[PDB]
Scaffold this motif. Sequence first.
Motif, PDB file in Angstrom:
ATOM      1  N   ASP A 161      50.076 -29.513  -0.888  1.00  0.00           N
ATOM      2  CA  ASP A 161      50.652 -28.220  -1.260  1.00  0.00           C
ATOM      3  C   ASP A 161      49.904 -27.593  -2.640  1.00  0.00           C
ATOM      4  OD1 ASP A 161      52.061 -28.238   1.061  1.00  0.00           O
ATOM      5  OD2 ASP A 161      53.968 -29.074  -0.053  1.00  0.00           O
ATOM      6  N   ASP A 195      53.116 -24.551   2.373  1.00  0.00           N
ATOM      7  CA  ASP A 195      51.799 -24.335   2.073  1.00  0.00           C
ATOM      8  C   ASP A 195      51.236 -22.574   2.642  1.00  0.00           C
ATOM      9  OD1 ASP A 195      49.459 -24.489   0.959  1.00  0.00           O
ATOM     10  OD2 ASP A 195      48.813 -26.249   2.056  1.00  0.00           O
ATOM     11  N   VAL A 234      47.228 -21.456   2.555  1.00  0.00           N
ATOM     12  CA  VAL A 234      46.506 -21.730   3.698  1.00  0.00           C
ATOM     13  C   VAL A 234      46.912 -20.885   4.888  1.00  0.00           C
ATOM     14  CG1 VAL A 234      45.554 -23.779   5.220  1.00  0.00           C
ATOM     15  CG2 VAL A 234      46.243 -24.189   2.888  1.00  0.00           C
ATOM     16  N   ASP A 276      53.412 -29.465  14.173  1.00  0.00           N
ATOM     17  CA  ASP A 276      52.961 -29.582  12.828  1.00  0.00           C
ATOM     18  C   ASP A 276      52.524 -28.115  12.494  1.00  0.00           C
ATOM     19  OD1 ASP A 276      52.677 -30.457  10.536  1.00  0.00           O
ATOM     20  OD2 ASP A 276      51.049 -31.519  10.721  1.00  0.00           O
ATOM     21  N   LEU A 278      25.852 -17.210  23.614  1.00  0.00           N
ATOM     22  CA  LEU A 278      25.017 -17.998  24.615  1.00  0.00           C
ATOM     23  C   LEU A 278      24.499 -17.003  25.820  1.00  0.00           C
ATOM     24  CD1 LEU A 278      25.195 -20.098  27.418  1.00  0.00           C
ATOM     25  CD2 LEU A 278      23.875 -20.556  25.216  1.00  0.00           C
ATOM     26  N   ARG A 314      22.254 -14.312  24.841  1.00  0.00           N
ATOM     27  CA  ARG A 314      20.829 -14.912  24.417  1.00  0.00           C
ATOM     28  C   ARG A 314      20.464 -15.112  25.845  1.00  0.00           C
ATOM     29  NH1 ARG A 314      17.316 -19.767  24.816  1.00  0.00           N
ATOM     30  NH2 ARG A 314      16.015 -19.697  22.900  1.00  0.00           N
ATOM     31  N   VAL A 315      20.815 -15.652  26.603  1.00  0.00           N
ATOM     32  CA  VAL A 315      20.056 -15.874  28.124  1.00  0.00           C
ATOM     33  C   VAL A 315      20.151 -14.824  28.913  1.00  0.00           C
ATOM     34  CG1 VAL A 315      21.175 -18.351  28.091  1.00  0.00           C
ATOM     35  CG2 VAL A 315      22.234 -16.665  29.268  1.00  0.00           C
ATOM     36  N   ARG A 347      16.772 -13.510  27.316  1.00  0.00           N
ATOM     37  CA  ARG A 347      15.826 -14.425  28.097  1.00  0.00           C
ATOM     38  C   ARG A 347      15.384 -14.044  29.462  1.00  0.00           C
ATOM     39  NH1 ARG A 347      15.093 -20.708  26.469  1.00  0.00           N
ATOM     40  NH2 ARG A 347      16.531 -20.818  28.148  1.00  0.00           N
ATOM     41  N   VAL A 348      16.532 -13.621  30.363  1.00  0.00           N
ATOM     42  CA  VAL A 348      16.221 -13.415  31.688  1.00  0.00           C
ATOM     43  C   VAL A 348      15.571 -11.934  31.897  1.00  0.00           C
ATOM     44  CG1 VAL A 348      18.615 -12.168  32.316  1.00  0.00           C
ATOM     45  CG2 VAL A 348      17.192 -13.948  33.980  1.00  0.00           C
ATOM     46  N   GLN A 381      12.301 -12.367  31.163  1.00  0.00           N
ATOM     47  CA  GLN A 381      11.627 -13.146  32.242  1.00  0.00           C
ATOM     48  C   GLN A 381      11.313 -12.136  33.227  1.00  0.00           C
ATOM     49  OE1 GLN A 381      14.112 -16.338  33.678  1.00  0.00           O
ATOM     50  NE2 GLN A 381      13.236 -17.785  32.044  1.00  0.00           N
ATOM     51  N   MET A 382      12.233 -11.268  33.634  1.00  0.00           N
ATOM     52  CA  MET A 382      12.124 -10.155  34.688  1.00  0.00           C
ATOM     53  C   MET A 382      10.650  -9.202  34.306  1.00  0.00           C
ATOM     54  SD  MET A 382      13.980 -10.381  37.277  1.00  0.00           S
ATOM     55  CE  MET A 382      13.975  -8.788  38.132  1.00  0.00           C
ATOM     56  N   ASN A 393       7.644 -11.226  34.428  1.00  0.00           N
ATOM     57  CA  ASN A 393       7.072 -11.819  35.779  1.00  0.00           C
ATOM     58  C   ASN A 393       6.636 -10.476  36.664  1.00  0.00           C
ATOM     59  OD1 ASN A 393       7.835 -14.407  35.631  1.00  0.00           O
ATOM     60  ND2 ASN A 393      10.180 -14.098  36.401  1.00  0.00           N
ATOM     61  N   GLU A 439      16.651 -17.362  38.554  1.00  0.00           N
ATOM     62  CA  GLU A 439      16.216 -17.059  37.319  1.00  0.00           C
ATOM     63  C   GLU A 439      17.298 -17.434  36.206  1.00  0.00           C
ATOM     64  OE1 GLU A 439      14.260 -13.670  37.049  1.00  0.00           O
ATOM     65  OE2 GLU A 439      13.450 -13.660  34.667  1.00  0.00           O
ATOM     66  N   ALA A 454      16.995 -20.424  33.064  1.00  0.00           N
ATOM     67  CA  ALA A 454      17.204 -20.062  31.675  1.00  0.00           C
ATOM     68  C   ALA A 454      18.158 -20.522  30.990  1.00  0.00           C
ATOM     69  CB  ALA A 454      17.227 -18.495  31.676  1.00  0.00           C
TER      70      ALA A 454
END
Lengths: 73, 219, 74
Positions: free
Chosen positions: A71, B116, B119, B183, B204, B207-208, B211-212, B215-216, B219, C8, C12
């Motif tokens: 604590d 406490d 915290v 607790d 995630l 980000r994909v 990237r896709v 990719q499009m 391509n 696709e 990825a």
Amino acid sequence: MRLPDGTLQVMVEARARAQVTDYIPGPYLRARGEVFSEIFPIDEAVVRVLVEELKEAFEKYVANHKSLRLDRY
Amino acid sequence: RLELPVIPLRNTVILPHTTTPVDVGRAKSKRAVEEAMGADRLIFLVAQRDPEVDDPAPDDLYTWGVQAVVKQAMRLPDGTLQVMVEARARAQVTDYIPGPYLRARGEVFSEIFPIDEAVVRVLVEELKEAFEKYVANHKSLRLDRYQLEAVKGTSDPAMLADTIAYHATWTVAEKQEILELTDLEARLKKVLGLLSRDLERFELDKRVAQRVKEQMDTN
Amino acid sequence: QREYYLREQMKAIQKELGGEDGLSDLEALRKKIEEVGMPEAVKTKALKELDRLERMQQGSPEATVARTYLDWLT
């Protein structure tokens, strides 16, 4: 406070230390002391500076309990 | 005290200050409601999965439940009775005597005490910014218009633990595996790790998505 | 639309668990040529045989001959 079951309720507070000059073969245990000896160092200001350094280290140690959860009191 | 019955739950848990009408149209649970009204007038709700037929499987019963009180006894014939409830804290029926039918003798309250507070302050700042960043993500406002200047004004641990996990739509297995530990801060670190998983899902899939779409057009 | 859209997306999603990292047999064969040895005329002959092997699709009858000559060299 003496409990007759094998449990001694006792709270002690030390005052000063001594030496051992005699041994007694048990039973019973008994010992002898000697005179008190301590030195008082001069220039207490730098000593208090070092005390403040160690207290600042302990103060940073209090908030750094991440694995035993102590604590902040 | 006296004989305290057990009433099962849906996939939706009831927490403190949760005003939600309960759907007891179950043919073996209405007698449990009648025993609960003659049993110091409180509904015992332990966490189950979805409504099934009158055969209690023993493995959906785990070690933790919630308390519900009976405030409005309005006889509605549709099978849904609006009950204002209030849990002072969370506890369960502890000891389990085997049936049939489902009845067991547990005892006195099981809790954690708030220690406490520093915290707790750091955690409530973290979850503070953590809910207000994720309210910017999706549509789940889920609050009726009676709180338009008082949404920021309470900083107690148990209520915020049972709101940030509560209004958040999870998988239900997570939503009831948070319950069993008792607790202080472990539950809140679980909430932190789970919405850290959530923001990782956000980074995630964005980000994909980036990237896709490259990719499009590539391509 | 849903077909090439979703596949696709799948291809990825699939690049975030393991980076290829490990060199393919060819790149590993080139660094195997470069590290151990070599006398330099034999080294340039081996690099020319390797660049001859790299242009090919796997399964050719003489790809077996070039691969066997290279791993007897290395």
